[PDB]
Nucleic acid binder design. Structure first.
Ligand code: CL
Ligand code: CL
Ligand code: MN
Ligand code: MN
Ligand code: MN
Ligand code: MN
Ligand code: MN
Ligand code: MN
Lengths: 94, 105, 84, 98, 92, 104, 96, 78
DNA sequence: ATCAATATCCACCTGCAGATTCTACCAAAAGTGTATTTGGAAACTGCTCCATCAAAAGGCATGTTCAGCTGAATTCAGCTGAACATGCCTTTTGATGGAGCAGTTTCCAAATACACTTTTGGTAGAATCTGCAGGTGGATATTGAT
DNA sequence: ATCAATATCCACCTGCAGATTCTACCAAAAGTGTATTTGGAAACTGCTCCATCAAAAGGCATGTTCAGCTGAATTCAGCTGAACATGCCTTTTGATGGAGCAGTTTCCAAATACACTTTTGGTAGAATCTGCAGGTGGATATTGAT
């Protein structure tokens, strides 16, 4: 039959992290999935455009970072860049 | 075997984000750190919204988050409002706001 | 099939008034309701136009929610909740 | 007999519908309108109920926003009652059909 | 190097107005126009192909993209010109 | 001989194809897609050039300057809509004065 | 001789609407640009074309904003544009 | 330094905008708005220049920034 | 209204540089011929879910009455902002040169793609569990009249 | 200033629709080996782009006078809100038939992949051609009073 993807389990993991005694409506979860996919498309799109601007054929974490700087507002961008750089540097220690 | 999410210490799926990057034709090549970084950012934004919405849900004495709580969260936070200025949340509604001139004299 | 006609009048005056109330409007001119019907007709026309364009590009005869979402996204009015 | 002053019930309703989130346009008439427009664009089309609902959500959201801006336009002209002139101004500044 | 639509815009100009010249800045405007419309059409077509899970962009995607992006009359004439050029191209 | 010639076009079919596939839009590009596209671009270019000439000298100037282009774009409804959020450099604005500001 | 107040205004309107030239002087604008850019990145450098482009964009934007503003002044049965009008304009525009 | 953009210049801009009569506070308000505009556009542009590992802000950086802002400008490369 | 006196605008003709247009030569696309994969149109059919219908009941739309207060119309003074003559100064033109970027290549370690195999996390189902919707009466709060 | 009439704020309870949890399949990461690019270090060069510096030519800051527009105040007709009786139609919830998605395969028209070959379009150069950009009489437009 049919198998569709979503960010539901991850959204629920993060939700349980921030508010252990809080549940979420399927509608609200739909809103969240739409949000994640939208931000995804924005970041990836901007990163694509920038990578294309400098004759580069590869989107590295740097392009993603600049994409975030462009798309996200002040503090949001700050903390986002923080979480990203953190995750990357932690990842490189395989 | 370890998932790249666990290695990066993320809840969000690094592998899936990577596949979506490759299967979206944003570039012919994709760096090793790009899906990690991106997944981290998405996870963070998700975290922030779920936080503010959670608070809004506590304020209205509810255990479960509905789109209304998400709307209140977005519109009451300046930055999330700006990031979602051209976005409509279904079943969200609007912020309670009445122009002062309209009030009884 | 029963012929559809003058359904813009289905959007009643009290409904428009409610939409105005949520918009924070206190007093409404009598000439407002028809104007609202017109603007609504234009908006809905554009959105549905693009949506159906997507629908028949997919060689489908059924308009899906995703067609509507893509249409709205293209119109600059992104909608969450039906994103699928 | 009892009677509320003109404007009071209005503010009351403003608060009421600003507290809630339900759709304000009746469902079946809206579905009729959508099917009419769509049929005029292309014949023998069928809709997922989801699509109709999405259309209604988008529509009412749009109209509420436009009504907010319109209200600002009415307040700007030192008025309280919104007028077609106000809507036309809001539409022009927005750039919908300037 | 640098590549532009300069010579092509000039040829078309000589098609429509054979005895009319064009400023350099205006040629810049035209170049920017062709580039922008290009990116619009190609982008809308790419999104179109991604929506229906198609991995190739045919002239069909281009046509639908044009129907979306261009207003009525311009859209019609563009579609007809396009189909024309395609049939003529496949005529040899 | 050239794909543009075989399509009866002035715009470069080959160049358009190359850009299309080198622009990260999709993995594969159809044979006729760049033809169609180049045709559309040539048509739009033609329209704008025509109107911008007609307007080029209702002002007595031969060379088409950005002003003439602006006039052509903004005087035509559909072109004005297509380029709704676009600024033509050194284009200026259309002569428009509100009747309310007029005396008597 | 003295022109009745409001005529030279219409005159200027017709003139600058019939023209295409930049209305802000080059050097003050460029100085402003370099100042603003400096507090983003130390001792940057600009192509002449970049500054010119910035000026075109700025003047176009401000002219349009002044059009919508003027409309907002007309709407309130006035003729003189006010900061209030500009404010309404950008608030409807979505810039606020 | 922002005062380099002066009353007659702003007046001329309003003239091209078809404005007949102008308030005194208008000029300051306009200086503010202009400041914001330049701040945003130059912000994005400088970001582009800095990703490109450059120290010279190009016209194309400005065009890209403008396009991103929703203020597409023809006649400078894009 | 159409008599004058400023000023303004316009339209004619005269004229070169600061730009346009038109040419003698070249790297890099663009085209051509020969194999190699493959996306997806075609076909068939399992399977949601869409269209449609019925019936009934109550939410709610519609049309009328009536008068409250809103917006439109008018008047008038005060002060805000346009017109203008005036005088200094920061602009614009423009010749420059020293240099510091930006753009170009040449190797090549490091990173990413590709291909196959193993493994499991993510999904679709069903079984299970529990906020809270939608009812209730009760004490406040607000609004209105007397 | 006080006392009804009515809307609204809550806390009560509780069964059910929607959310949560539990469990076998399996698409898709993940692991491992090997093929293929990649984007900056050294090394370099020639457009740009600055930074002074000497000048004029126009633009702006400035101060005075007043035309007239803005905004306060007052007035009143009429429109739009509030309350209600009347009854229609949109709900609600069920039950169908079947259209037409969408999962599964199955050949081939059409795309890609290098391998050479031909043409073109881009630069730096000559030999063009046109709108500024002044000067002048005449018709407009504007503002004042024979
Ligand atoms: Cl050197
Ligand atoms: Cl001149
Ligand atoms: Mn927490
Ligand atoms: Mn917490
Ligand atoms: Mn094709
Ligand atoms: Mn159930
Ligand atoms: Mn081969
Ligand atoms: Mn004459």
């Amino acid at each position: 039959r049919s198998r569709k993807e979503s960010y539901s389990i991850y959204v629920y993991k993060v939700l349980k992290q921030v508010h252990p005694d809080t549940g979420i409506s399927s509608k609200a979860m739909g809103i969240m999935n739409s949000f994640v996919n939208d931000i995804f498309e924005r970041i990836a799109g901007e990163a694509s455009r920038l990578a294309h601007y400098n004759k580069r054929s590869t989107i590295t974490s740097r392009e993603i970072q600049t994409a975030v700087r462009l798309l996200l507002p002040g503090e949001l961008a700050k903390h986002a860049v923080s979480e990203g750089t953190k995750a990357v540097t932690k990842y490189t220690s395989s | 075997a370890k998932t790249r999410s666990s290695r990066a210490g993320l809840q969000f799926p690094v592998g899936r984000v990577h596949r979506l990057l490759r299967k979206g034709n944003y570039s012919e090549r994709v760096g090793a750190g790009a899906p990690v970084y991106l997944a981290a950012v998405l996870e963070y934004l998700t975290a922030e919204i779920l936080e503010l919405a959670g608070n809004a849900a506590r304020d209205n004495k509810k255990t479960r988050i509905i789109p209304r709580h998400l709307q209140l969260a977005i519109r009451n936070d300046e930055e999330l409002n700006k990031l979602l200025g051209r976005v409509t949340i279904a079943q969200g509604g609007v912020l309670p706001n009445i122009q002062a001139v309209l009030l009884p004299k | 099939r029963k012929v559809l006609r003058d359904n813009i009048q289905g959007i009643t005056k009290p409904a428009i008034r409610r939409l105005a109330r949520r918009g924070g409007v206190k007093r409404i001119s009598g000439l407002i309701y028809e104007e609202t019907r017109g603007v609504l007709k234009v908006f809905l026309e554009n959105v549905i136009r693009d949506a159906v364009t997507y629908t028949e590009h997919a060689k489908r005869k059924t308009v899906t929610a995703m067609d509507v979402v893509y249409a709205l996204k293209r119109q600059g009015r992104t909608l969450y909740g039906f994103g699928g | 007999p009892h009677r509320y002053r003109p404007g009071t019930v209005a503010l009351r309703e403003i608060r009421r519908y600003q507290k809630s989130t339900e759709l304000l346009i009746r469902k079946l008439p809206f579905q009729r309108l959508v099917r009419e427009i769509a049929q005029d664009f292309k014949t023998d089309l069928r809709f997922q109920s989801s699509a109709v609902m999405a259309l209604q959500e988008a529509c009412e959201a749009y109209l509420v926003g436009l009504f907010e801006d319109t209200n600002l336009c009415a307040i700007h002209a030192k008025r309280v009652t919104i007028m077609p002139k106000d809507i036309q101004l809001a539409r022009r500044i927005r750039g919908e059909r300037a």
